[PDB]
């Protein structure tokens, strides 16, 4: 009986650390989606010929 109770305590404990990380997984999704959106935005730019043209004239 005692080890069955120790497992539910371990089950509370486990539940505590996931709801905690929840809060910081929720944000990192937005941070990761912002990181990938904007690198995807850039890779596009540099493959679009008016930008390529401008980048060449940008030292002269």
């Amino acid at each position: 009986r005692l080890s069955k109770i120790i497992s539910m305590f371990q089950a509370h404990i486990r539940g505590y650390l996931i709801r905690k990380a929840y809060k910081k997984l929720q944000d990192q999704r937005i941070g990761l989606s912002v990181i990938q959106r904007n690198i995807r935005k850039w890779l596009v730019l540099r493959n679009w010929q008016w930008w390529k043209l401008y980048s060449k004239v940008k030292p002269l």
Partner: protein, 138 residues
Amino acid sequence: LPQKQIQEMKEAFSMIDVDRDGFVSKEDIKAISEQLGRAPDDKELTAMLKEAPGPLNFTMFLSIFSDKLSGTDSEETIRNAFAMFDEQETKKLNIEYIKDLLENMGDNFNKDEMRMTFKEAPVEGGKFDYVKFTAMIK
């Protein structure tokens, strides 16, 4: 929008335009492109000015360049967004952390986007400088 760039992109508009008529005509794009490096062709060059109905006036030049740059999140957002992963404020991120992130979670990058993303990226000491990479991306 920013005036700084209205003031630069008008200067650039002065070179792209070779014949001075004031409209970027196709023969100018070729002429400046021969004058810079290996030109694009016709497949391409025709297609460039088929992104602007109507005469490529200086104002149409501005438009298309900003109805393309204007989406993107600003400077401080694409960095606050990397610092989330950088808990100690070392303004850098371990190269295989950011690669594992970008390649495998969220809307994963594929091997080519991957290759392109790190062709010019800041790395030194196994560390990826995201304040710099962000300036560059941006």
